[PDB]
Structures are given as C-alpha cells and as structure tokens.
Amino acid sequence: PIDDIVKNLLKFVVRGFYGGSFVLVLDAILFHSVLAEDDLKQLLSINKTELGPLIARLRSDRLISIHKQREYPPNSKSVERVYYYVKYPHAIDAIKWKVHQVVQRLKDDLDKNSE
DNA sequence: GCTAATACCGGGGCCGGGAGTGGCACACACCTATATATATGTGGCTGGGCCGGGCA
C-alpha cells in the first residue's frame, strides 16, 4: 500500500540521518499508534533526560505530533500521558523540503570554487 | 402595572505539586601494622621529701 511506503521512507530518513535511538522511538510509534511516555521509558530503559532530546528532535523535524491525553483513573490522579503519533504529511513535506535545501546548498558551493 | 428567562457571585468538594525525606549507585582518600635518624613541646603519670591535720 501507499501507507507502508511512508513508513519505509521514515525508516530510511530517520535511520539515514540520525542515530539508533531515533529509529527506536520511531519504530516504537510504528508498532503502537498511541505510545505513552511511560511505555517508551520502560521499553528502552532510558532516563528522562535521554528521552527528552529524542522526542524534541523528532518534533523539531515535524516527524511526529504529540497528544497529551488526560487521565483520572483509580487514585483520582490527573495522570497525563504524552501519546506520540506519526505525522505522515508533515514528515514527508519535511523530507522533500530538506532534500531540496541540501541540493540547493550543495549547488551554491560549486559555483564559488569554479573561479 | 405585572411575570418568566438569563447571568453573576459564593461555598463545599476535588486534583496537582515540590521541597522534604528517604533510598540507591559510583568514585576517591584514610589508616591501621611496621622501620631509622632527630628534638623541642608539652601531656600525663608517678616516687620521694616536706608540711599540716588527726590521734594517742
């Protein structure tokens, strides 16, 4: 289908331009449509200061959007859970525009050393 | 002159937190044991002679 080609695209871009934990979180969202913050912490066994910059990096690239869902279950605790969701069109647009900017920025450097 | 729908304020009940307390993990210095030369520098303890108090 067309939806799976977007998944392979995100795997190629995140795997190709970032480290491993980025595709760890990425695949962790590709397996579960709504991934809680406590599930990703207990999954990769990473600290909060290590889960922070990863989610912030995946949000700065417009790859995923977050959904802070409310909770008032058992102990009447307002348990908020940041459920991550893959933003397909904004991520594809980010990939296309970033590729265009890479081509344009690598084309300008050739004209300077030509003379 | 008369009546029903609308909006503002207060009280009792309910939820999040962060400095406090406590717990867990990792890394680095101490200092006990022993050795010689050296000496001022006391700190502390003990025996003999002298004096004052108790006793015959």
Resolution rounded to one decimal, in angstroms: 4.8
Q: Which nucleotide is nearest to A72 (CA to C1')?
A: B15
The structure tokens listed for A34 are: 């709504």
What 3-state class would DSSP assign to A73?
coil
The structure tokens listed for A18 are: 């970032």
- Count of residues making up chain A: 115
Q: Which nucleotide is nearest to A80 (CA to C1')?
A: B16
CA A102 from centre of chain:
20
Q: Which residues touch strand B (CB under 7 A)?
A: A 71-72, 76-79
The structure tokens listed for A75 are: 């102990």
How far is A72 from A74, CA to CA, in rounded Å? Answer: 7
Q: Which nucleotide is nearest to A77 (CA to C1')?
A: B15
Would you say A59 and A35 are in contact if contact means Cβ atoms under 8 Å apart?
Answer: no
Q: Cα–Cα distances in Å, from A41 out to A28, A61, A83, A103?
A: 11, 21, 12, 37
The structure tokens listed for A20 are: 């491993």
Max CA separation in chain A (angstroms)? 72
SS3 content of chain A, % helix, strand, coil (to 5): 65, 10, 25
Q: What's the CA–C1' distance between A102 and B31, in Å?
A: 64
| Residue A76: CA count within 13 A, CB half-sphere | 0
Q: What's the CA–C1' distance between A13 and B35, in Å?
A: 71
Write the DSSP symbol of residue A86: E
Would you say A43 and A10 are in contact if contact means Cβ atoms under 8 Å apart?
Answer: no
Nearest CA among A1, A2, A20 for reference residue A11: A20
Nearest CA among A85, A106, A105, A103 for reference residue A10: A85
